[PDB]
C-alpha cells in the first residue's frame, strides 16, 4: 500500500534513487506532453 | 527409547498402565468370565495382572520384551475394550446378551479408526445424556 517493500540495503537505496530520477523524469516528460497538447488545444479552441 | 517424546522409563510405564487398565476393563465388563472371544484377544496382557506381580516386575518383563510392549497397538486394543465398557456402563439396568457384546466387539475390531467413528460419537451422546440425568433435579424437561 504505502511503500514498495524492496528490502532495506544499499541495493535498495541505489534502485530507489534511480526510481526517483526515473519518476521525476517521467513526470516532466508527460508534463511536457501535456503542455504541448494544451497549447495546441487552446489554439484549437480559438480557431 | 524416546518414542512420542517419552523417556524409556515413561514409555514402559505407559505400557504397564495400558496392561493394568485393559485387565480392569475386562474384569469390569465380564466378572462372569463368559466374553471368551474378547478375553482371548487380551490374554497376553491380562495374564500379567491376573498374576499378582509387582508393578516394576511387569516393567522389567516389558523391557526384556516378555510382556507385550507396542504402546500404539495396546492403545488401539485398549480403546476397543474401553468403548464396550462405556456402552455397558451407559445401559446398566438393561445389560444385553453377551454374544451381542462379542458381535459389537467384532464390528469395532474391524474398524480402520475406531476413535474417529460414529460409534464413539453415539457413546459420547449416551454419556452426556446419562451423566446429566444422574444429577439433574425433577422438572418436565428432566422427566
Amino acid at each position: 500500500k504505502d511503500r514498495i517493500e524492496i528490502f532495506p540495503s544499499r541495493m535498495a537505496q541505489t534502485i530507489m534513487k534511480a526510481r526517483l530520477k526515473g519518476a521525476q523524469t517521467g513526470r516532466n516528460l508527460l508534463k511536457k506532453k501535456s503542455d504541448a497538447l494544451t497549447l495546441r488545444f487552446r489554439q484549437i479552441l480559438k480557431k | 527409547i524416546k518414542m512420542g517424546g517419552l523417556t524409556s522409563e515413561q514409555y514402559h510405564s505407559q505400557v504397564v498402565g495400558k496392561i493394568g487398565y485393559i485387565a480392569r476393563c475386562m474384569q469390569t465388563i465380564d466378572p462372569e468370565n463368559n466374553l471368551k472371544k474378547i478375553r482371548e484377544d487380551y490374554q497376553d496382557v491380562l495374564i500379567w495382572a491376573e498374576k499378582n506381580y509387582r508393578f516394576e516386575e511387569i516393567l522389567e518383563a516389558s523391557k526384556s520384551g516378555k510382556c507385550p510392549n507396542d504402546l500404539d497397538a495396546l492403545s488401539r486394543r485398549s480403546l476397543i475394550l474401553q468403548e464396550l465398557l462405556r456402552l455397558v456402563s451407559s445401559i446398566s439396568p438393561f445389560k444385553m446378551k453377551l454374544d451381542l457384546i462379542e458381535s459389537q466387539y467384532e464390528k469395532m475390531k474391524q474398524h480402520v479408526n475406531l476413535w474417529k467413528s460414529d460409534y464413539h460419537v453415539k457413546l459420547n451422546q449416551l454419556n452426556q445424556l446419562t451423566d446429566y440425568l444422574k444429577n439433574a433435579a425433577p422438572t418436565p424437561k428432566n422427566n
Partner: protein, 602 residues
C-alpha cells in the same frame, strides 16, 4: 552445605549471588530479606546470576539468597478456574483478600491454590488397592464448576501400584487422596501436583488438527480458519484490534476452557475481562452459566516487573497443557509475544550477551519455536483415553507497526495461521482489521474434510470470496492511474461484491448485540447470498453483452437497489432474537428475490 548464598551485586532485574556453588541453572531462588522470587539464568564460578521476577529496587549486597532445588513450577489442581494469577502463580484474589491493598506487595508468598477449600472428590471406582497405575491416569473427578469437571490425574513422572485411594468425600490441597508404591518406595499425593513450567507435559501422540476453532468473527472463521490444536499469530500495530480478537475468542468460541495470558498488557484489559466474563453466559444442558467458570487469567501488566513476562507465558501454556491432559479442547491467548521477546531482550542486555536483530537475543527464535509448538491435538497420557488439545493464539505487537519485526519474522516461520492486521483498516474503523491479502491458514487441507461433511457448498464459496477480494486490489492499481470509467461491467460487479463482502461480511462490530457472535450458518448464509449475487450479476452480463441488449452494473443497481440494501442488512440478524431456521428462511427469500429480479433483466 549452606541453603543460602548472598547477593554479590544487582542491576535492574538481574542479581548476581556469591556462595552459590552447587546451584543448578534454571533453579528457582528466593532473593533478599523480603524473599523476592527469581531463577538462575547463568553460572560463573562458585557464583550465580539470577533473573528476578519482582523489581529489585531495595535489594542490598550481602542480602541472603535462598536456594530451593526446584525449577520454576506451577501448582496444578482444583480451584484454578475463574482465578487470576500473576506471572509467578500468586492468586490475585487472595492477595487482595489478605492485604486489603490496591497493589500487589513485593515479597508475597501466597499459596498458588486455596488449600483451605474442601472440594468434592469422586474417586474413579475402577481403581482399588494393588491396581497398576501410570502418569496421566484419572484417579478421580472433582466437581469444581457446573461447567468444568476437574479430572485429577497422576503426575506424569509418577508410576506404580495403588497403596491407598480416598473414598468419595470432601478434601483439600493438603489432604492425601492417593498413595502409590514403586520399587518398594511409597509415594503419597494430594489433589495438587506441581510441574516445571519449562518442561513440556508429555503425551501419547500429537495428532493432526481437524476440527475448526469456531470464533465469533466472520472473516476469521470463513477465510483464514484456526483449528483446535493449531497455533496462530495476530501481528498488528497499536490499536489494530488484536486484543479484541483475543477477547472475542475467549468470550465466544467452541474452546472447552480458555487460558488468557496478559503478558505485559495494559491493566484495564484485566479489569475489562474480570468485569465482562462473570456476567457473560454460555449454556450447557438447559442451564445458562457464567463463562468465567471456563477460564483462567494469567496477568502480568506492562508495569509489573519485566522478568515475570517469561514466567507468565510459561505459566499460561503449562496450565493449558494441564487442561489438555484432561481431554478439554483448551485455547490459550498469548496476549503479546513481542512484549515477551522484549523481556528476553532485557535479561540479555543485563547479561551483556551478543544481540541478534533489534537487540533481541539469538535464542528468541528458538524460545518462540519451542513455545508455539507446545500446541496440538493429543492422545493424552494414561489409561482412560482422551483427546485434549491446546490451541495457541499469539498477539505479536511489531515495533513501529512493521512486519520486518524480528518477533513477527520468527513467529511467521512457526505458526500455521497468520491473521495480519492492517492499521489502515483500523484507522477507517474497519474491524476486525484482518488484511485478507497477507493473512493465510495452513489448516485448510485438513479442515476441508470437516467442511465436506457438514457444509459441502462452502469450499467453492471460500474460493470465490478470496478471489473477488484479490481482484479488487488488482483493479485498484489500474483505477488509481486512469479512473473508474476504464472498468468493464464485470469489474464494476467485482468491486461492488467486493464492497459488500468488505463492508457487510468482513466488517463486524463485535461489542454490538448483533455482531457479538456469528454462527457458521449465519456466516455462510451471508457469504452465499453475496457470491450468489456475484455469479448471477456476472452471468447476466456474460449472457447479454453478446448483443445490443447488454445488461450493465448500473442497470442491475437501478432495478435491484433494494436487493443491495437487503444484502447489506444481513449482518443485523440477531441469534438471541432469530432462530437459525428464521435467519436461513430470510436468506432463502433474498436468494429468491435476486433470482426473480435477474430473471426479469435477462
Amino acid at each position: 552445605e549452606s541453603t543460602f548464598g548472598y547477593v554479590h551485586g544487582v542491576s535492574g532485574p538481574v542479581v548476581t549471588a556469591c556462595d552459590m556453588a552447587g546451584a543448578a541453572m534454571y533453579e528457582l531462588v528466593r532473593v533478599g530479606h523480603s524473599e523476592l522470587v527469581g531463577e538462575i539464568i547463568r553460572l560463573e564460578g562458585d557464583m550465580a546470576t539470577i533473573q528476578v521476577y519482582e523489581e529489585t529496587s531495595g535489594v542490598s549486597v550481602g542480602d541472603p539468597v535462598l536456594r530451593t532445588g526446584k525449577p520454576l513450577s506451577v501448582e496444578l489442581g482444583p480451584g484454578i478456574m475463574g482465578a487470576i494469577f500473576d506471572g509467578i502463580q500468586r492468586p490475585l484474589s487472595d492477595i487482595s483478600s489478605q492485604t486489603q491493598s490496591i497493589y500487589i506487595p513485593r515479597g508475597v508468598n501466597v499459596s498458588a491454590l486455596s488449600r483451605d477449600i474442601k472440594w468434592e472428590f469422586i474417586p474413579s471406582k475402577n481403581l482399588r488397592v494393588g491396581s497398576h497405575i501410570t502418569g496421566g491416569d484419572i484417579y478421580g473427578i472433582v466437581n469444581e464448576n457446573s461447567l468444568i469437571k476437574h479430572k485429577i490425574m497422576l503426575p506424569p513422572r509418577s508410576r506404580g501400584s495403588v497403596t491407598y485411594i480416598a473414598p468419595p468425600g470432601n478434601y483439600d490441597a493438603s489432604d492425601v487422596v492417593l498413595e502409590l508404591e514403586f520399587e518398594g518406595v511409597k509415594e503419597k499425593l494430594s489433589m495438587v501436583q506441581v510441574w516445571p513450567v519449562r518442561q513440556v507435559r508429555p503425551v501419547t501422540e500429537k495428532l493432526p488438527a481437524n476440527h475448526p476453532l469456531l470464533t465469533g468473527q466472520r472473516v476469521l472463521d470463513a477465510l483464514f480458519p484456526c483449528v483446535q490444536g493449531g497455533t496462530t499469530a495476530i501481528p498488528g500495530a497499536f490499536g489494530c484490534g488484536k486484543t479484541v480478537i483475543s477477547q472475542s475468542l475467549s468470550k465466544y468460541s467452541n474452546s472447552d476452557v480458555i487460558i488468557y495470558v496478559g503478558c505485559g498488557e495494559r491493566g484495564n484489559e484485566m479489569s475489562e475481562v474480570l468485569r465482562d466474563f462473570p456476567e457473560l453466559t454460555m449454556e450447557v444442558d438447559g442451564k445458562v452459566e457464567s463463562i468465567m467458570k471456563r477460564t483462567a487469567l494469567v496477568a502480568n501488566t506492562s508495569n509489573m516487573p519485566v522478568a515475570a513476562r517469561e514466567a507468565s507465558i510459561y505459566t499460561g501454556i503449562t496450565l493449558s497443557e494441564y487442561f489438555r491432559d484432561m481431554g478439554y479442547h483448551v485455547s490459550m491467548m498469548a496476549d503479546s509475544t513481542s512484549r515477551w521477546a522484549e523481556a528476553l531482550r532485557e535479561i540479555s542486555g543485563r547479561l551483556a550477551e551478543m544481540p541478534a536483530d533489534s537487540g533481541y537475543p539469538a535464542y528468541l527464535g528458538a524460545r518462540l519455536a519451542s513455545f508455539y509448538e507446545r500446541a496440538g491435538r493429543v492422545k493424552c497420557l494414561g489409561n482412560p483415553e482422551r483427546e485434549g488439545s491446546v490451541s495457541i493464539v499469539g498477539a505479536v505487537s511489531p515495533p513501529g507497526g512493521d512486519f520486518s519485526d524480528p518477533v513477527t519474522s520468527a513467529t511467521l516461520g512457526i505458526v500455521q495461521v497468520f491473521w495480519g492486521l492492517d492499521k489502515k483498516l483500523a484507522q477507517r474503523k474497519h474491524f476486525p482489521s484482518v488484511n485478507w491479502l497477507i493473512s493465510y491458514s495452513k489448516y485448510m487441507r485438513a479442515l476441508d474434510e470437516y467442511y465436506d461433511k457438514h457444509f459441502t457448498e462452502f469450499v467453492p464459496l471460500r474460493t470465490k470470496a478470496k478471489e473477488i477480494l484479490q481482484e479488487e486490489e488488482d483493479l485498484a492499481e489500474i483505477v488509481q492511474l486512469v479512473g473508474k470509467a476504464s472498468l468493464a461491467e464485470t469489474d464494476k460487479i467485482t468491486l461492488e461484491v467486493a464492497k459488500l463482502i468488505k463492508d457487510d461480511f468482513l466488517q463486524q462490530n463485535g461489542y454490538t448485540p448483533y455482531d457479538r457472535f456469528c454462527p457458521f450458518y449465519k456466516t455462510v448464509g451471508m457469504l452465499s447470498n453475496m457470491i450468489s449475487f456475484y455469479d448471477m450479476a456476472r452471468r447476466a452480463v456474460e449472457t447479454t453483452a453478446q448483443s445490443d441488449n447488454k445488461i450493465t452494473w448500473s442497470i442491475i443497481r437501478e432495478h435491484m437497489g433494494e436487493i443491495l440494501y437487503k444484502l447489506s442488512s444481513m449482518k443485523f440478524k440477531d441469534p438471541v432474537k432469530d432462530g437459525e431456521a428464521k435467519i436461513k428462511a430470510d436468506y432463502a427469500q433474498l436468494l429468491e428475490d435476486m433470482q426473480n429480479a435477474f430473471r426479469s433483466l435477462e
